[PDB]
Structures are given as structure tokens and as C-alpha cells.
Amino acid sequence: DICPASEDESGQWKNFRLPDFVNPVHYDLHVKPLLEEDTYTGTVSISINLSAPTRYLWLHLRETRITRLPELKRPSGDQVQVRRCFEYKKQEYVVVEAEEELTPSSGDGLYLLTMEFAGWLNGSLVGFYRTTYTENGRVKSIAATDHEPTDARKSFPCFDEPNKKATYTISITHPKEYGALSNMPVAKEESVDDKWTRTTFEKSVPMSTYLVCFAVHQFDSVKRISNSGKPLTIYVQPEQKHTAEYAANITKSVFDYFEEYFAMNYSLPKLDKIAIPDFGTGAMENWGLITYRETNLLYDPKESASSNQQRVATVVAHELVHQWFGNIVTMDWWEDLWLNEGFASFFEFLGVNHAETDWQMRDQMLLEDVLPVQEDDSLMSSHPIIVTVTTPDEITSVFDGISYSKGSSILRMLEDWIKPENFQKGCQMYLEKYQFKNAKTSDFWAALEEASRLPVKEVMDTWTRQMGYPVLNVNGVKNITQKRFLLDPRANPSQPPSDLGYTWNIPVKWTEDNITSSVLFNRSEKEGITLNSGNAFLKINPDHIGFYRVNYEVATWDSIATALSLNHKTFSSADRASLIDDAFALARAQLLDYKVALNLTKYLKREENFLPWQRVISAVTYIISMFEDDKELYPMIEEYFQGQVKPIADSLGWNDAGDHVTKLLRSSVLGFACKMGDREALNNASSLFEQWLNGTVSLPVNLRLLVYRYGMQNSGNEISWNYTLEQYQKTSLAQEKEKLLYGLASVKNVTLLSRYLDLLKDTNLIKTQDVFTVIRYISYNSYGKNMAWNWIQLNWDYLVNRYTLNNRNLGRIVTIAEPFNTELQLWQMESFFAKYPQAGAGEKPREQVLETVKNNIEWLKQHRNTIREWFFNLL
Numbered sequence: 001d002i003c004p005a006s007e008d009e010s011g012q013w014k015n016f017r018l019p020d021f022v023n024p025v026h027y028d029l030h031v032k033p034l035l036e037e038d039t040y041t042g043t044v045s046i047s048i049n050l051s052a053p054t055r056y057l058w059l060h061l062r063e064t065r066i067t068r069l070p071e072l073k074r075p076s077g078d079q080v081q082v083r084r085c086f087e088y089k090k091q092e093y094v095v096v097e098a099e100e101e102l103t104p105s106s107g108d109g110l111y112l113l114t115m116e117f118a119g120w121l122n123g124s125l126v127g128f129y130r131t132t133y134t135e136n137g138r139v140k141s142i143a144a145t146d147h148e149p150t151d152a153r154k155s156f157p158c159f160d161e162p163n164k165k166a167t168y169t170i171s172i173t174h175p176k177e178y179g180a181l182s183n184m185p186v187a188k189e190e191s192v193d194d195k196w197t198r199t200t201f202e203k204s205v206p207m208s209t210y211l212v213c214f215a216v217h218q219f220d221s222v223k224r225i226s227n228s229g230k231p232l233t234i235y236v237q238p239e240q241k242h243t244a245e246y247a248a249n250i251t252k253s254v255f256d257y258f259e260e261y262f263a264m265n266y267s268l269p270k271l272d273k274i275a276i277p278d279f280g281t282g283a284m285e286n287w288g289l290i291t292y293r294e295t296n297l298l299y300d301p302k303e304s305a306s307s308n309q310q311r312v313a314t315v316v317a318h319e320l321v322h323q324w325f326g327n328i329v330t331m332d333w334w335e336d337l338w339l340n341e342g343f344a345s346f347f348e349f350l351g352v353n354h355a356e357t358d359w360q361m362r363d364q365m366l367l368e369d370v371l372p373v374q375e376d377d378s379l380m381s382s383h384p385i386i387v388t389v390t391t392p393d394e395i396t397s398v399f400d401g402i403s404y405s406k407g408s409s410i411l412r413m414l415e416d417w418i419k420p421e422n423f424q425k426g427c428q429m430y431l432e433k434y435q436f437k438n439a440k441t442s443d444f445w446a447a448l449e450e451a452s453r454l455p456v457k458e459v460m461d462t463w464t465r466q467m468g469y470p471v472l473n474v475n476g477v478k479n480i481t482q483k484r485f486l487l488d489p490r491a492n493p494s495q496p497p498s499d500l501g502y503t504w505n506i507p508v509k510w511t512e513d514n515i516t517s518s519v520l521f522n523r524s525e526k527e528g529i530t531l532n533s534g535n536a537f538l539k540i541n542p543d544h545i546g547f548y549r550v551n552y553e554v555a556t557w558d559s560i561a562t563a564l565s566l567n568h569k570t571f572s573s574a575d576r577a578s579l580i581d582d583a584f585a586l587a588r589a590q591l592l593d594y595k596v597a598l599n600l601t602k603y604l605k606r607e608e609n610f611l612p613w614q615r616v617i618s619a620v621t622y623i624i625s626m627f628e629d630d631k632e633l634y635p636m637i638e639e640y641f642q643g644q645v646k647p648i649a650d651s652l653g654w655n656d657a658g659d660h661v662t663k664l665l666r667s668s669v670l671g672f673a674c675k676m677g678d679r680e681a682l683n684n685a686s687s688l689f690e691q692w693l694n695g696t697v698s699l700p701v702n703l704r705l706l707v708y709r710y711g712m713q714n715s716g717n718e719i720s721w722n723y724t725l726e727q728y729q730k731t732s733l734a735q736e737k738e739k740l741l742y743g744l745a746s747v748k749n750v751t752l753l754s755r756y757l758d759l760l761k762d763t764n765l766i767k768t769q770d771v772f773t774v775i776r777y778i779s780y781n782s783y784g785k786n787m788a789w790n791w792i793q794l795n796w797d798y799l800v801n802r803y804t805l806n807n808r809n810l811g812r813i814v815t816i817a818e819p820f821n822t823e824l825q826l827w828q829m830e831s832f833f834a835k836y837p838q839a840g841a842g843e844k845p846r847e848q849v850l851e852t853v854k855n856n857i858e859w860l861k862q863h864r865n866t867i868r869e870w871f872f873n874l875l
């Protein structure tokens with residue numbers, strides 16, 4: 001009404017990107033929520049540096065509306081007269097036209113634009129919203145913001161691009177029973193009424209809109225003090241207060257570690273963490289006020305698993321990295337998102353490794369990021385680390401494996417090649433140089449290039465400006481050539497067009513008889529290089545440190561299998577995991593005969609280490625899933641792999657004993673035994689489940705999930721299903737809730753799974769943050785595979801209306817179709833996609849899952865007989 005929508009395209013506001021000549025300096029932001037009404041109002045005053053004559057001023061606004069006609073101030077101070085305001089939907093702008101137009105701000109004086117606005121707190125997990133929880137039987141409220149990447153514009157009108165850094169003075173008018181939090185400490189509190197308080201926070205440092213955060217809450221707190229003398233506090237519901245202890249510890253330890261490591265002071269006087277009871281992502285690095293999903297912050301040593309502990313520590317560490325990489329220095333544009341995400345995904349491991357010494361975190365990088373993303377990045381529908389993005393949907397889509405895991409992986413490779421000391425020094429200089437500003441990828445290379453004088457830009461550009469990665473083909477023992485590695489052998493290796501033509505500058509490392517050497521394999525060496533003793537065996541890519549695969553000659557592979565059977569200890573745990581991982585990915589890609597890959601699994605009865613078992617379980621899970629309905633192959637694959645894990649599963653037992661890594665190993669090894677149909681392992685699960693149903697016995701924390709899953713799967717019925725649902729409602733611990741949700745998804749009953757799916761529409765039962773997690777759990781169920789898939793189709797309009805097409809998790813839900821492997825299923829997918837062609841943030845996930853399912857169909861055609869033969873001849 002006040003700024004009506006107009007389809008007028010004849011202006012600079014038709015451009016997706018904000019103009020270069022309008023820059024903000026300072027935001028004066030005031031909001032007043034009506035919590036019990038799910039509304040808020042506010043006024044924002046923005047000081048503006050203008051660089052070019054313009055009759056229009058525009059900025060981002062979505063959903064929230066302008067209520068008062070905006071008012072502009074000349075740098076002199078005079079009121080600039082306003083003809084109209086209008087909204088431009090196509091590019092999420094509100095535009096105001098001055099009567100005549102005005103000129104640049106030449107000195108230290110600035111324009112001032114103020115606008116009044118009103119928005120909603122309901123039906124959303126982005127912008128500024130309210131959610132509830134129960135305390136001593138009463139329903140309580142908490143309101144908070146979530147902006148990354150393009151949702152600040154929903155909270156309040158702003159210049160909502162990461163490079164438009166400005167300073168912030170925030171105030172909130174809230175009922176007095178509530179506290180108010182933001183990025184900065186409280187400056188002053190003043191009574192509006194005897195019912196209302198105005199909380200004003202001190203001026204911010206220059207920062208991006210996506211980092212701006214405020215909250216209205218009635219939470220208790222757990223407190224700590226950094227070595228800096230600055231308060232680090234975690235806000236938490238009173239009844240959950242005890243579960244904030246571990247996070248508080250790790251925050252302290254990792255905060256102190258990073259500040260020293262980066263040789264730079266944390267820029268704010270305090271740091272707060274808070275878990276919002278319903279929160280749409282894992283966590284968000286809002287400067288000085290980091291928001292969490294409860295599962296990533298709140299941990300109970302008496303009820304939570306080692307897996308949970310590691311998750312909490314890692315996400316906390318992750319969020320802390322951002323206070324330097326992301327917050328102090330921010331990428332200039334979303335195309336360089338990896339400068340934020342990859343860095344956090346890398347340093348999170350260094351942080352947690354400092355806090356928790358015997359966790360082998362450095363090695364766990366292979367399991368968490370390196371090897372999983374080498375799967376992702378072997379698809380044609382991957383994308384380069386530096387990604388062209390032209391819509392909000394495209395922007396949000398790139399918060400993915402490539403930005404996080406491949407980002408992390410190529411930094412891991414870079415560090416090892418360039419040496420840790422120089423990497424560390426180079427990071428510091430980057431952080432010194434671009435503090436409170438924005439950087440491009442080019443800026444980071446130059447920084448490390450100053451610290452090494454090694455050709456960082458020349459080498460790292462090849463890993464950064466094109467998708468994919470190479471396989472090193474071994475001829476002789478030491479001639480290597482490079483070739484792009486693609487899972488689909490039919491795919492055109494030169495597509496999509498790359499200036500670098502899918503060749504890489506590969507820092508190559510290798511071990512000759514316990515001694516290590518290093519060579520940069522140059523792109524221009526078209527016919528390959530030769531590795532510089534009289535050797536009978538060369539170990540290329542130790543600890544899988546380089547982001548590539550090594551395809552040895554078949555004879556070498558055959559010798560490796562034999563060396564593993566004789567004494568697997570000859571190789572390090574990481575090397576074993578890497579060799580197994582490569583071999584199975586190579587077999588999957590039709591670059592190595594499956595018999596050769598499977599031969600590597602023969603030694604496993606003697607395998608006792610975490611890393612190899614994890615990557616074995618990963619490779620087997622795929623193969624088993626492809627033969628799930630094959631009555632001929634399946635029992636043979638089951639029988640064999642059951643036999644291979646049995647010794648280690650039996651040896652570790654059904655009890656929480658040993659160090660961190662052992663406990664993680666026990667979980668995944670017993671899980672695999674159960675998955676492979678080991679009667680005794682299933683009987684342990686059912687026995688413990690039967691005991692848990694008796695209401696007293698608290699299950700061993702690292703066995704719980706397995707007991708809920710396989711217990712429900714093997715002996716669950718309506719009685720125990722209803723009981724489990726009650727327990728899920730009754731527990732305050734989100735980490736327990738989540739396990740119980742997986743339990744509920746495991747019942748072998750169509751009626752009960754149908755009841756479960758219906759609960760997804762009930763916001764009193766399933767939180768908005770948890771809906772996709774549940775759909776995915778149900779999709780893993782032998783009945784639920786098609787149930788979840790059918791349900792998201794039938795309810796697609798409902799989901800789109802609830803979440804919007806800009807929602808990343810909604811875009812991704814189609815990946816529940818990954819196990820599909822028939823022409824019929826592929827046709828179903830294509831038919832559904834054709835019916836709802838507006839994919840939004842699901843555009844890439846759709847491309848990826850289609851490629852996967854097409855690969856699956858081909859894989860079955862190519863390998864069924866070979867794999868059948870290997871198993872038949874063995875058993």
C-alpha cells in the first residue's frame with residue numbers, strides 16, 4: 001500500500017547486484033516485538049555515502065513491509081523531498097525516488113535514510129522470529145534472528161550484500177520479564193513503561209548484514225572467562241543448564257587457542273552462545289552471539305554419545321573460526337564463500353585437536369571431509385570452488401560439500417605442501433591485511449605467496465577455478481600421468497568447458513621405504529612425470545594428503561592385498577583407509593576391476609582401526625544397497641561381510657569401554673554387524689531394547705542409537721512405538737530426541753510409518769527444524785524408502801508453502817532418491833521434476849541425484865556378474 005509493488009524495470013534497481021556508488025556507513029536499528037501477537041515493528045536510520053548522481057535510492061527488503069514513507073536527509077542536514085516509494089519484487093528491493101535527484105557526499109558528511117517497518121514473527125525460521133518451549137509446565141517464548149545468506153532483508157530493510165559492511169547500534173524495546181542480547185554488550189537499559197524496557201547495545205565494529213543478530217529471551221547462563229579477560233557465556237534453558245558445561249569448556253579452550261594461533265585479538269568485548277529451541281541450520285557465527293541448534297551445543301555426559309561430544313566440540317570450534325575467518329575478514333561476494341566455510345571446516349579440526357588430545361582429529365579429517373567430498377566432486381554436476389551465483393537461490397545452494405569439505409581438503413593439501421609454519425604465518429598476514437574488510441580468493445593466494453614465495457596462485461588456481469580432481473595413473477613403479485576422475489565413464493571429460501582444461505598442478509608426496517619426498521607435478525608436463533634407491537614399492541599420497549586418487553598397476557594392487565593379509569600393519573591406518581577408498585572408487589568408475597578392489601577386503605578379520613573400518617563400511621554400504629533386492633547376490637555379500645566384522649565386533653563387545661576413537665569404532669562396527677544380519681548382534685540390540693522399554697535402565701550412551709534402531713526394527717510394535725514417541729516428547733535433551741526419532745523411523749510397519757509421516761504436519765510434535773531429518777530417517781527404512789519419496793511428492797506444494805523454494809534443506813530433500821537404481825525409478829524422478837520444474841535451491845541437488853541414479857543403473861549393468869562371480873567363487 002505505502003510502497004506498492006511496481007513492475008517498472010527502467011532503472012538500476014533491475015540489476016541483481018546493488019550499485020557500486022551507494023555505500024552505508026552506520027545503521028541505527030530499533031525493533032519492538034509483540035511476542036504474544038507474533039508481530040514486530042521497527043525504525044532504521046542508515047548513514048549513506050553516495051558516489052554518483054541518482055534520483056533513486058534502493059535496498060533489500062523481503063516480506064516485512066514499509067509502514068511510514070521513508071525520509072532522506074542531505075549531508076548538510078536538510079530534508080530531501082520524496083516523490084514515491086515502490087517495491088521491486090523480482091530483485092527484492094524497496095526503492096524510493098527523490099523529487100529531483102542529488103549529488104555525491106564529498107567530505108565526512110553523509111546522507112541519512114530512515115524507514116519505518118513492520119514484520120511477522122511466525123511461520124518461519126529466518127529473519128526475526130519467535131519460537132516456544134515448556135518450563136515447569138508453562139509455555140515460554142524466545143525470539144531471535146537468522147540471516148545467512150539473504151535473510152537480513154526479512155528482519156529489516158538493509159544493503160544486504162556481504163561487502164556492504166557498516167557499523168551497528170542496535171536497540172530493542174521488549175517486555176521487562178525478558179533479557180535482550182545482540183552482537184555487542186549492553187550499553188544502557190531504560191524503562192519505557194513499568195511493563196517495557198529499551199535495551200541499547202554499544203556501537204558495533206564494521207560488519208556484514210548477515211552477521212547482525214539480536215534475541216529476546218528468558219534463559220539462564222553458564223559463564224567462562226578467556227585468557228583475554230573477556231566473558232564467554234552460554235545461554236541455556238534453566239532445566240537444561242547442566243548440559244551447557246561441555247560447550248563452555250570447549251569455547252574457552254578453543255577461543256584461547258585460536259586467538260594465539262591467528263596472532264589476532266577477538267574484535268568484540270564479549271562472546272555469547274545460545275541454542276534456539278527451533279533453529280533452521282546447524283549453527284550461525286553471528287559476531288559475539290553465536291546461535292545453535294540444541295544438538296550441536298548441548299551435551300550430557302550421562303546421556304549423550306562420544307559422537308555427540310565430538311559434534312558439539314567441532315561445531316563450537318567451527319563457529320569460533322568464523323570470528324576470524326568470515327567475521328573480521330569476509331569474502332567480497334558469495335562466489336568466494338569457501339574463504340569463510342572451507343577455512344572454518346579446516347581450522348575446526350585444529351581447534352578441537354587442541355582441546356581433545358587423543359581424538360586423532362587430524363586423521364578424522366579424511367573421514368569427515370576429504371573422502372566424502374571426493375565422491376561428490378567426481379560427478380559432472382559438481383561445481384568449481386569459486387562459483388558464479390546470480391540469484392538468492394543460487395547463493396544459498398553453494399553452502400554445500402564443495403564450499404565446506406573440498407574447501408577444507410584443498411587447504412589441508414596446501415598446508416602440507418607449503419608447510420604448517422608458513423601456512424600459519426600466511427594466514428595471519430591475510431588477517432592483518434583485510435581486517436574489517438572483504439577479500440577475494442586472489443587476495444589469499446598472494447598472502448601465502450608472500451609467506452612462501454612458492455607459486456601458490458599458479459598451483460591453487462587449478463584446484464579452485466575448475467570442478468573435479470585427478471586420478472594419478474601409475475606406469476612402472478614411478479611414472480605417473482594425470483587424468484580427470486569421473487565416476488561416469490560415459491561422461492565427456494572436457495565438460496563443462498574449463499580454461500584450465502581439467503589438468504592440475506598437483507603437489508605430489510610419496511614414501512620410499514619410510515622416507516618421504518615431494519614434487520610439484522606441472523600441468524604443462526603433458527606426458528607426465530617420473531618420481532625420483534632401487535625400489536620394489538612406492539607409497540604415493542601418504543595419509544591421502546593430496547586431493548586426488550592413485551591408480552597403481554594391477555600387479556601392485558594385487559601385491560597390496562597380499563601384504564595386507566600377511567601384515568596389514570605394514571601400512572598406517574590412514575594409508576589403509578585411503579587405498580581401500582581409492583580402489584573402490586576406481587572400481588565404481590570402471591577404472592579398476594572389482595575383483596582387485598574386493599581382494600583388499602580379505603584381511604579384514606584382523607583389522608582393528610577406526611579409519612579403515614569406516615571407509616570399508618562406506619564402500620560396502622553402497623554395494624549392498626545396489627543389490628538389496630537381488631536374492632542371489634545379497635545373502636552372499638551379507639554372509640561375507642558379516643564374517644569380516646565379526647571378530648572386531650565380538651572383541652569390542654556391547655559396553656562403553658576404551659578411549660574416544662575405540663568407542664566410535666565400537667558404534668560403527670556393531671552397527672555394521674547388525675546391518676549385515678549378525679544374529680548375536682541383533683539379539684544384543686533386541687535384549688537391550690526390551691530392557692530400555694522397562695523404563696529404568698539407562699542404555700550405554702554409545703550403544704543407544706543402535707539399540708533404538710535395531711531394537712525397533714526387530715521387535716518393535718505399536719506398544720513400543722507409542723512408548724518411544726512418549727519418551728521422545730518427555731526428554732529435554734535434543735541429542736536423545738534425535739536418536740528416538742531414528743528409532744521411530746525404524747519400525748517395520750506401514751501403518752506406524754504412515755502415522756509418523758502425518759506427524760510432520762503437527763508442529764506440537766515435530767519441530768520445523770526436524771522435519772527433513774525425519775523424512776530422511778524414514779527414507780532409510782526398507783518400507784520407508786518409497787513412503788518418504790511418495791510423501792514429499794504428494795505434499796510438495798505444502799512443503800514449498802511452509803519452507804519456500806529458497807530453503808536449502810527443502811531443495812536437498814530429493815537426495816532421499818540416491819539409492820534408486822532402476823529405469824522405472826529414474827522415470828518417476830524425472831516425471832515428478834517435470835511436474836514441479838521450479839526447483840529453487842533444489843536445482844543442483846536435482847541434477848546431482850539424477851546423475852547418481854543414472855550411474856546406479858549403469859553400475860548394475862556393468863558389475864553384477866563380476867561381483868557375483870567374486871562372491872560365488874569365494875564362498
Ligand SMILES: *[C@@H]1O[C@H](CO)[C@@H](O[C@@H]2O[C@H](CO)[C@@H](O[C@@H]3O[C@H](CO)[C@@H](O)[C@H](O)[C@H]3NC(C)=O)[C@H](O)[C@H]2NC(C)=O)[C@H](O)[C@H]1NC(C)=O
Nearest residue numbers: 646649650651653654679680681682683684685686687688
Ligand atoms: C551378544 O553378542 C555376543 C557376541 O558378540 C554373544 O556372545 C556369544 O555367544 C555365543 C553363543 O553362546 C558364544 O558362542 C561360542 O563361542 C565360542 C568361542 O570361544 C565357540 O568356540 C563356541 O563354539 C560357541 N558355541 C558353543 C560353545 O556352542 C560366543 O562365544 C559368545 N561370546 C563372544 C564374545 O562371541 C551374546 O550371546 C549376545 N548377547 C545376547 C543377549 O544375545
Ligand SMILES: *[C@@H]1O[C@H](CO)[C@@H](O[C@@H]2O[C@H](CO)[C@@H](O[C@@H]3O[C@H](CO)[C@@H](O)[C@H](O)[C@H]3NC(C)=O)[C@H](O)[C@H]2NC(C)=O)[C@H](O)[C@H]1NC(C)=O
Nearest residue numbers: 558559561562595596598599600602869870872873874875
Ligand atoms: C584376486 O581376485 C581373484 C579373482 O576373484 C582371485 O582368484 C580366484 O580365487 C578364487 C578363490 O575363491 C578361485 O575360486 C575357485 O574357482 C573355481 C572355479 O574355477 C572353483 O571350482 C573353486 O571352488 C573356487 N574356490 C572356492 C573356495 O570355492 C578362482 O578360481 C580364482 N580365479 C582366478 C582366475 O585365479 C585371487 O585369488 C585374488 N587375489 C588375491 C586374493 O591376492
Ligand SMILES: *[C@@H]1O[C@H](CO)[C@@H](O[C@@H]2O[C@H](CO)[C@@H](O)[C@H](O)[C@H]2NC(C)=O)[C@H](O)[C@H]1NC(C)=O
Nearest residue numbers: 037038039063119120121122123124125801802
Ligand atoms: C503469520 O500469521 C499471520 C496472522 O495469523 C498471517 O497472516 C494471515 O495469513 C492468512 C493466510 O495467508 C490470511 O488469510 C490472513 O488474511 C492473514 N492475516 C493478516 C492479519 O495478515 C501471516 O501470513 C503469517 N505469516 C507467515 C510467514 O506464515
Ligand SMILES: *[C@@H]1O[C@H](CO)[C@@H](O[C@@H]2O[C@H](CO)[C@@H](O)[C@H](O)[C@H]2NC(C)=O)[C@H](O)[C@H]1NC(C)=O
Nearest residue numbers: 242243244245246247248249250252299300301
Ligand atoms: C569442564 O572442565 C572442568 C574443569 O576444567 C572439568 O572439571 C574437572 O573434572 C575432572 C574429572 O571429572 C575432575 O577430576 C576435576 O576435579 C574437575 N576440575 C578441574 C579444574 O580439573 C569438567 O569435568 C569439564 N566439563 C565437562 C566434561 O563437561
Ligand SMILES: *[C@@H]1O[C@H](CO)[C@@H](O[C@@H]2O[C@H](CO)[C@@H](O)[C@H](O)[C@H]2NC(C)=O)[C@H](O)[C@H]1NC(C)=O
Nearest residue numbers: 717718719720721722723725751752754755756
Ligand atoms: C497408540 O497411539 C495412538 C495415537 O495416540 C492411539 O490412539 C488411537 O489413535 C488413532 C489414530 O491412530 C485415533 O484414530 C484414535 O482416536 C486413538 N484412540 C484412542 C485415543 O482411544 C492407540 O490406541 C495407541 N495404541 C496403543 C496400543 O497404545
Ligand SMILES: *[C@@H]1O[C@H](CO)[C@@H](O)[C@H](O)[C@H]1NC(C)=O
Nearest residue numbers: 023024025163164165166438
Ligand atoms: C562499501 O561497499 C564496497 C563495495 O566495493 C565494499 O567493498 C565496502 O566494504 C563497503 N563498506 C565500506 C565501509 O566501505
Ligand SMILES: *[C@@H]1O[C@H](CO)[C@@H](O)[C@H](O)[C@H]1NC(C)=O
Nearest residue numbers: 475476477478479480529530
Ligand atoms: C617411464 O618414463 C621414463 C622417462 O621418460 C622412461 O625411461 C621409462 O621407459 C618409462 N617407462 C617405465 C615402464 O618405466
Ligand SMILES: *[C@@H]1O[C@H](CO)[C@@H](O)[C@H](O)[C@H]1NC(C)=O
Nearest residue numbers: 717718719748749750751752
Ligand atoms: C502394524 O501396526 C498396526 C497397528 O498396531 C497393526 O494393526 C498391524 O497388525 C501391524 N502390522 C504388521 C505387519 O506388523
Ligand SMILES: [Zn+2]
Nearest residue numbers: 318340341344
Ligand atoms: Zn561455517
